[PDB]
Amino acid sequence: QGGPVEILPYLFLGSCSHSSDLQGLQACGITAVLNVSASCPNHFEGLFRYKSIPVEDNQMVEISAWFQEAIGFIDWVKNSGGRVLVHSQAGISRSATICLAYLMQSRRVRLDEAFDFVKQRRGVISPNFSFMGQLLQFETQVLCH
Numbered sequence: 001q002g003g004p005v006e007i008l009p010y011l012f013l014g015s016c017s018h019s020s021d022l023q024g025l026q027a028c029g030i031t032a033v034l035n036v037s038a039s040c041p042n043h044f045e046g047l048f049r050y051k052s053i054p055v056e057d058n059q060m061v062e063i064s065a066w067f068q069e070a071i072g073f074i075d076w077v078k079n080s081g082g083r084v085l086v087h088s089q090a091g092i093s094r095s096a097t098i099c100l101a102y103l104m105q106s107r108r109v110r111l112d113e114a115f116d117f118v119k120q121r122r123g124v125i126s127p128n129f130s131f132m133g134q135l136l137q138f139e140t141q142v143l144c145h
Contacts, residue, residue: 061090
């Protein structure tokens with residue numbers, strides 16, 4: 001029971017085909033669009049604020065470089081923009097991971113309570129099933145740093 005990701009009525013995230021009806025419904029009344037494609041951190045605005053995150057092409061694109069970018073783009077929209085929607089590009093939870101950083105550096109809940117809030121269990125990326133070691137790493141990475 002999961003798939004689509006949505007944090008509060010201001011932050012929205014997709015993942016699989018659900019990103020179509022979702023990104024479209026919000027598109028009608030959207031403000032900041034996190035186009036996870038390329039062109040590095042680009043700040044366009046076809047309709048309001050188009051954000052572009054540099055994606056990669058290997059395994060699942062390491063998301064350790066979008067920590068400050070995610071919380072800087074998502075927070076910059078909630079503090080002035082309005083609604084930020086992160087799109088996907090491989091039926092993966094990469095987009096939900098970006099919003100995770102926001103809830104971490106902004107809500108201070110670490111990937112533990114943050115991942116548990118953005119959605120329910122069932123949904124582990126990369127080799128990380130039945131394991132509780134990854135915790136202080138992302139914490140000091142998105143919060144402390």
